[model samples]
Target: MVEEVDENSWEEKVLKSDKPVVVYFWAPWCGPCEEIKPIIEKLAEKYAGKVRVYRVDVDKAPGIAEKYNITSVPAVLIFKDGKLLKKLFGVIPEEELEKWIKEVL
Candidate 1:
């Protein structure tokens, strides 16, 4: 499972990580978010020690959501060195996501 983050821990955990961070911004009511969740979980396990995977629920953590200027659910944000490297909206194929991560790394 992807690690879950709330508004409180977001700064220290998500933003401060030394390794690359992949954040999936989602909500419980979104259909596409549901579809992409398992794929994200698989990545969390696959990249286990290489990167940081976080799941942020928009509903539960509105503060962090707004901070990222989240425009949609199922959004994927990739960060490296505490800077956002890429932002993707909607459901993404696992291979593509993995490839993107590899490219950044």
Candidate 2:
């Protein structure tokens, strides 16, 4: 399952994580967010021990959305060593995401 996260747990669960982290920022009403949700969840399972996945509800955590300069929902931010590595916008294919993650690792 994609770990649900908020500003309060962001540091501990994502920023401080030892593994590469994929932070998916989304909103409940976003159609694309829903469309990509399963893809991210599958990625979370496929990468299990290799990486980490976290979901941030944009509506519930507006501060994080602002901090990240979120212009839209379904934004994916990949991080490693407390630094951002990649940013994916909108709905992306699973194959592409897998390749990207593999290249990052």
Candidate 3:
């Protein structure tokens, strides 16, 4: 399951994770964000133990959102070794995201 992270846990759960982390930035009212929820879940299960998956509610994590310059919802940020590796915006196909995940791995 993809856990939810806030600014308080962001540092330890995401940046310091041993495995590559997939952080999905979203909000309650974003239609596209809801649309991609299952895709993120599937990927989380598919990549369990290999990748760390977490979702950040933009409204609740305003500091992190600002730090990442997340101007919109439905954004996916991949990180490794405490650094961002990729930034994917909007609703992306599972296949496409899988490809990017593989690249990161």
Predicted structure with the largest TM-score when compared to the true one: 3
Which residue pairs does candidate 1 place in steric collision? none
Report how far residue 18 has shifted in candidate 3, in Å. Answer: 1.0
Give lDDT per model, in order: 0.87, 0.88, 0.92
Q: Once model 2 is optimally superposed onto the true structure by TM-score, how far is the C-alpha of residue 40 displaced, in angstroms?
A: 0.7
Q: Per-residue lDDT tens digits of candidate 3, residues 1-105?
A: 989999888889988999899999999989998899999999999999999999999998899999999999899999998999899998878898999889888
**Candidate 2 local Cα displacement, residue 5, angstroms:** 1.1
Better of 2 and 3 by lDDT: 3
**Per-residue lDDT of candidate 2, residues 1-105 (tens digit):** 887899889899888999899899999899888788889989999999999988889899999989888889889998898998888888888898888789768
Provide the RMSD of all predictions against the true structure, rounded to 1 decimal: 1.1, 1.0, 0.8
Query: lDDT score, residue 95, model 3?
Result: 96
Clashes of each: 0, 0, 0
Clashing residue pairs in candidate 3 (N, C-alpha, C atoms within 3 angstroms): none
Runs of candidate 3 with Cα error greater than 4 angstroms are none
TM-score: model 3 vs. ground truth: 0.96
Candidate 3: residue 25 Cα off by (Å): 0.6
| Clash count, predicted structure 2 | 0
